[PDB]
Design a protein around this ligand. Sequence first.
Ligand SMILES: [Fe+2]
Ligand SMILES: [Fe+2]
Length: 130
Amino acid sequence: ALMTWTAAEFGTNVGFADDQHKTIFDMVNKLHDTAATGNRSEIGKQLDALIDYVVMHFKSEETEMQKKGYADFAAHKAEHDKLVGVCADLQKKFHAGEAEVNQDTTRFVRDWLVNHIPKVDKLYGPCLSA
Ligand SMILES: [Fe+2]
Ligand SMILES: [Fe+2]
């Protein structure tokens, strides 16, 4: 629902990355649907699953970038690390009962992804596909 992956918009020419992006999009979509309900326990389970996967995806990209000497690795990692800090803060507040997760939360994640993948991830394609 919320997100649709296509190669034209988001293809990196890096198979593992494209596959992990498609999983992220599916997990955002699930959270997005659940976030229109009051099922707070289900929201939390899906939130935590999504964030765990996103962090793992970032680690996967970072390991490959740094092992190959990719030119823009440190700046790219910095973008990841700011998102992880926002996500961790959201988890802390959500799991304390101090903030809610709603469809603005999933639209923010969508916004971040739809900018980051074409403008930041695509740039590693020549290096990581070589
Ligand atoms: Fe990515
Ligand atoms: Fe990335």
